[PDB]
Design a protein around this nucleic acid. Sequence first.
RNA 1: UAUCUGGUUGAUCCUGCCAGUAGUCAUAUGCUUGUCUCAAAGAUUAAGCCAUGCAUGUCUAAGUAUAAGCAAUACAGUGAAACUGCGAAUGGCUCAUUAAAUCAGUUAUCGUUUAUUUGAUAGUUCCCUACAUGGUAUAACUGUGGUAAUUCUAGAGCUAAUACAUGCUUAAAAUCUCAGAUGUAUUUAUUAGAUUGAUGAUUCAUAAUAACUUUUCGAAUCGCAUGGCCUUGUGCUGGCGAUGGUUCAUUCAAAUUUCUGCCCUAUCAACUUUCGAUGGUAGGAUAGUGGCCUACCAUGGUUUCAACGGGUAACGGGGAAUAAGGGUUCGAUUCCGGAGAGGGAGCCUGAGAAACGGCUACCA
RNA 2: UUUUACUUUGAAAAAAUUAGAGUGUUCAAAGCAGGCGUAUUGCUCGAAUAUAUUAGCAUGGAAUAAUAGAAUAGGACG
RNA 3: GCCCGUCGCUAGUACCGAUUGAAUGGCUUAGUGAGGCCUCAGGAUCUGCUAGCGGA
Lengths: 160, 184, 67, 142, 258
Amino acid sequence: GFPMKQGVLLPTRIKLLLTKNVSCYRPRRDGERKRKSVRGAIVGPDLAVLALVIVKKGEQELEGLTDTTVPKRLGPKRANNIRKFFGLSKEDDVRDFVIRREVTKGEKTYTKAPKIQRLVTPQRLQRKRHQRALKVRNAQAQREAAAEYAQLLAKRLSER
Amino acid sequence: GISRDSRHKRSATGAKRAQFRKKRKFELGRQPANTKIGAKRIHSVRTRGGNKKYRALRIETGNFSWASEGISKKTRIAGVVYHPSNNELVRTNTLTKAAIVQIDATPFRQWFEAHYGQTLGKAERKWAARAASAKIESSVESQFSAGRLYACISSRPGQSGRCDGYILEGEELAFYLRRLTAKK
Amino acid sequence: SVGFGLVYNSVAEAKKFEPTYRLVRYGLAEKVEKASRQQRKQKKNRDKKIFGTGKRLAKKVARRNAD
Amino acid sequence: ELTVQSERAFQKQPHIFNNPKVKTSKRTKRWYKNAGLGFKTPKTAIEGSYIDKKCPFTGLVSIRGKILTGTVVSTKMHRTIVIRRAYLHYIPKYNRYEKRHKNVPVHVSPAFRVQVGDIVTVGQCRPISKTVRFNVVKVSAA
Amino acid sequence: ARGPKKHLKRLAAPHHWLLDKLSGCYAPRPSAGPHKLRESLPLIVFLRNRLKYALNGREVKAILMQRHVKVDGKVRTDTTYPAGFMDVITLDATNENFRLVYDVKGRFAVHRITDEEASYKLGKVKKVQLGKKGVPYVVTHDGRTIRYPDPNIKVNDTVKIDLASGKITDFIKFDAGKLVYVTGGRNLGRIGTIVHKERHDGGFDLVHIKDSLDNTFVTRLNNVFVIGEQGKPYISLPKGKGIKLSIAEERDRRRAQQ
RNA sequence: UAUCUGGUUGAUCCUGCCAGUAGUCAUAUGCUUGUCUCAAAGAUUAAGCCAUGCAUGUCUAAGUAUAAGCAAUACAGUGAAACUGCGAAUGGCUCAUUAAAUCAGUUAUCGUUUAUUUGAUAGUUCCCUACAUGGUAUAACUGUGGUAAUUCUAGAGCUAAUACAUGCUUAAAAUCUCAGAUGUAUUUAUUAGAUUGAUGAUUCAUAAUAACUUUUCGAAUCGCAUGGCCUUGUGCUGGCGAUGGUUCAUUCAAAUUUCUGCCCUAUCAACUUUCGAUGGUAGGAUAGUGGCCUACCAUGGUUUCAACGGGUAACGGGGAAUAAGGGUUCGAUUCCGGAGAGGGAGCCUGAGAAACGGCUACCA
RNA sequence: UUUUACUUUGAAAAAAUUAGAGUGUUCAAAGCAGGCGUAUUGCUCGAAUAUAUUAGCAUGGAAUAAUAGAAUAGGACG
RNA sequence: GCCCGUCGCUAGUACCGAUUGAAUGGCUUAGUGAGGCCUCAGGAUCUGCUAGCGGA
Ligand SMILES: [Mg+2]
Ligand SMILES: [Mg+2]
Ligand SMILES: [Mg+2]
Ligand SMILES: [Mg+2]
Ligand SMILES: [Mg+2]
Ligand SMILES: [Mg+2]
Ligand SMILES: [Mg+2]
Ligand SMILES: [Mg+2]
Ligand SMILES: [Mg+2]
Ligand SMILES: [Mg+2]
Ligand SMILES: [Mg+2]
Ligand SMILES: [Mg+2]
Ligand SMILES: [Mg+2]
Ligand SMILES: [Mg+2]
Ligand SMILES: [Mg+2]
């Protein structure tokens, strides 16, 4: 039952100290690494099962290859992702034909349309305005505090 | 790993100390950088407190300051000619603080020409304002005819990733010239 | 006999600020019948081992045991 | 110190620049400091040519801890002495004392001249060696 | 020992909390905050042991999470917020304002104050330092930094802090003859006038204090807090005014109630 | 709360021990055991070995929700799973090591790191998106499986962010360079820092100049209310907050650190020094000082005032027993400090571990 | 304004523990509680004090004990 | 009266003792040396900009 290692290039199985961003291992703790025995990259009789990806269609279709197909389980979620999917350009008001789903559960079937992220919204525009105005307000407050303190210094320096 | 503790390193009476407190991470040392010349390669080390150090390996350019006209041009380090701590560092051209190196001197000559207009080594009257009092020295300009300026490293390449320094001048330069005309 | 007493300004504040065990004693909202502590801890330990939802493991042991 | 430039490196105070462009008077600009606590900076420190980055007056070390007094018992190291610090320790059961001593290695600047004897005052500094945590600040050659 | 401790065992808590011994194994560990660990008084302690408003820590956090308590103008919903000396604890439900001040026994006395003087608070200037861009600032005993301070405000002075704008309205200068609270040591909680300051370069600054009854006690400069001049304290003093009666006259005052 | 008595003689007075006597939060054991309050308890020997079960997880309004999860015109509520964040370095246990080591009291950091809390703090960013950039990205989920077995995972299809990686909007004011540069962060050099702030004291705070960076930061984030003015539109504005973020200060801390103080032993008197021992210069390394390490050099450093070595059925202290006074003995153990997680060593993550209810290797 | 010892005073020497103040836990060991009046829509006292006398720190004293002064005067005074 | 020592029997406790005796534990020269870490490289395959060229 040992999986294959993408680039080991051996016909047997060997132990590697596996890390976060590698196959055959899921770290149970931040920073964890484990020495697990993985199987090499070159196929041989030892393999109980191979894993192949169809990249070319030659002749009569297999009955589980093109006839029966699955839909894409989830539509895009980000605003620009829906734009890039359905082809509509920037100024097209993309909140309308978001793919939905009807739930035949209790004869009410209230569609669960996904929330969209990064959407240009007046709430986010108000947040941006609030931040970019807080910055200038703070800068003006600091400038006037410094000015009045300089006034105090140039007043208390007049005593000689 | 390497430990900077004093629980080893037997006491001043000469007594060998008994061991307690297996090595602590707050006492670790690390490997020397041994910065070489050319094809900049800097590695980021994660240090205590989440901070970062930069191990310079194979550094090619350094920021060197004349300190007499205050220019601090960025230039190329040619090689190491003298090191007070280890001649092996000179042999291996290992870049290190306080190493005496040779720098290109071309940016310094270009700045001298754009500033004084006085043909150092081979908006009109700014050269007049920077008046005849422009003679630098009889040892810092004779190196411009060879295009190699003696300099001393001042940063720590293994710590800061940079190989900055200053051009030798005056009695420091005389000292290092004596050392070089002895050991060369 | 000497004890302590509280008088809440309203039954709303009574329900909001009173301990659940004392409300149960009195006769207000009653105990939630949780499993024993050992069983709940063993259960969360058993759920620690499985990674995701579990339906994957369900359909995987749907074929095995037996063939 | 008998050809002060006696090391492999050039000995100099850091960031104390003698500009060869300006035609100053001394041409050997020398930094010093007042150590504090009423220890007078000696004229040897003011006018000498030694470097001693561990000197409490011309070096990079500060006197900020305990001020101790002791008797110099060794001057055989370079810029370092060992001072003897005799005291009496109380033994309560006998209501009496016993003589005890502790040797203390101290860094002595070239500003001072110190021989065996020469009760000295020393001030705590940062650890400047494996065993040295004190700098001579008053020679008091008794 | 591998990191910062998060527990405070009972019998390790500061004694001036008057904590019960056989209540539990642990005390409320003061979270990091303005004053200190030892010189602090957690809001749970002040709400469940100094006023008896709450009966448990659960009830303390119940009081806290509905924004009732307020430390120095802000809400401070932290169950173990380290409130300390000169802090204003105002509660609007049961509207009343307390100033955490030391009684003469050295505990945080419950000292009701009025809003017209709870508006502000006092602060002992811990340090005067130039910040980035050459902007001077003062650091006070409660960990407050205040920019552009008066150029005559030095260390050990006291500053009156608006506590709504957080700025210096006035400042008392440390000098012989001003009213000082003692905020540490054996005489913790006493009030008096500065008589003399012994310098001790390198060592510790000492100050001799003469209370109203002409008792003269010396103490370290670290824990003396200027609170105004004699007879004109810039704040309201607690019920005892830091007199430090001896046990005999204390027993006498007690038996004067028959 | 200052006490003695029996035993050497035929008898005596002594020395002197044996014996008696009293206590022990001081342990065992025998016999006995009705009541109330309090509650030590696998330390001693084996820091010996351990079946089994539990002991570290965590969600608000406020990071990410199309659960084919529930329930009454995009989800408006709840919400498994998962990603993200934070925590898991606290606690609890034990006393094996450990004799200038720990520890105690007392110092220092002008010798450093410091998540968090608290307070303050950032108009300067650009060489055809900002009315908001990408997948170069993936999880959960869907379907195909291998192994007897693990908190094992491969293969294929989506999918977001406060994950990841990029990237603009803020004039005005503002001086130097020969139109450009001028925030902050890093590195170097120089200058001021006086008599124009502070300290007992600095090459301090801080500012300036000239440059330098395998780019640092300068919110492309979230909630609840929606208000005011108006070119009435996709207008302009404006709240209270949350989270995040540079630097400084603060706090919780950490690490080093001054002085003085440890039991028996000389049938331990010299020890340390090639192989760092003591110091100097320089460098490297560290968060930082420092022979911490390296190179060169010097020949030092400790010691009868007991070094060095050996023993401890030795963790240190607060304390405990007994006690006229002085002392003697004890302290594994309710608090503080230390160390360890079978013996060593190494290391990932992280502010913080040389972590062991984390990993890696060797030994048993 | 030589150098010490000594001694007085003061700060320090966590809490618990110890001595110990108050307090009818029914007494007591203990604990830091509690007390005082009423038909309130509540008033009030406390959780002291002493000691850790080694080491360091600050201060008063100047007996006791040690130490140093001007002798080839390189002495003191303005 | 009291008394001393050899020798002989019994029992016990230590001592010396061929056996280059034995076992256990500590320290240690030398040899070999796992492992992680730093470093010289290396390049499966994984997408991007146009065989040119970069990044992981
Ligand atoms: Mg007896
Ligand atoms: Mg045991
Ligand atoms: Mg612990
Ligand atoms: Mg500086
Ligand atoms: Mg060094
Ligand atoms: Mg002991
Ligand atoms: Mg032991
Ligand atoms: Mg103990
Ligand atoms: Mg034991
Ligand atoms: Mg403990
Ligand atoms: Mg540990
Ligand atoms: Mg075990
Ligand atoms: Mg470990
Ligand atoms: Mg365990
Ligand atoms: Mg643990």
